[PDB]
Write a protein that binds this DNA or RNA. Structure first.
Length: 63
RNA sequence: UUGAUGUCACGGAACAGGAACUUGAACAACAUCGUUAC
């Protein structure tokens, strides 16, 4: 859990509503550095949460 | 022609059963072709 010099938070993989989300995970997410992804209204984030997306941060277009 | 905080589809052998088989001495003798004459 060390990209270049910063640590990485375990990320959040649990929403509240389930009307969207055509499918859910059944995979047993890989674990490292037991901590908490606490801040929901933050100002800085762990690089994994900058890859997740918490208008768009990183946008993937169609191929 | 997708929408985002959540995709084990490399998560799944086009697989499993059905005799190209059955019947047959490489052997042998009587003709062929039509009209002539009162």
């Amino acid at each position: 859990g060390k990209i270049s010099e910063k640590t990485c938070c375990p990320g959040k993989f649990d929403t509240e509503d389930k009307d969207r989300l055509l499918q859910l995970r059944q995979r047993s997410t890989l674990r490292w550095t037991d901590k908490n992804p606490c801040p929901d209204n933050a100002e800085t984030y762990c690089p994994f949460c900058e890859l997740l997306g918490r208008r768009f941060r990183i946008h993937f277009g169609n191929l």
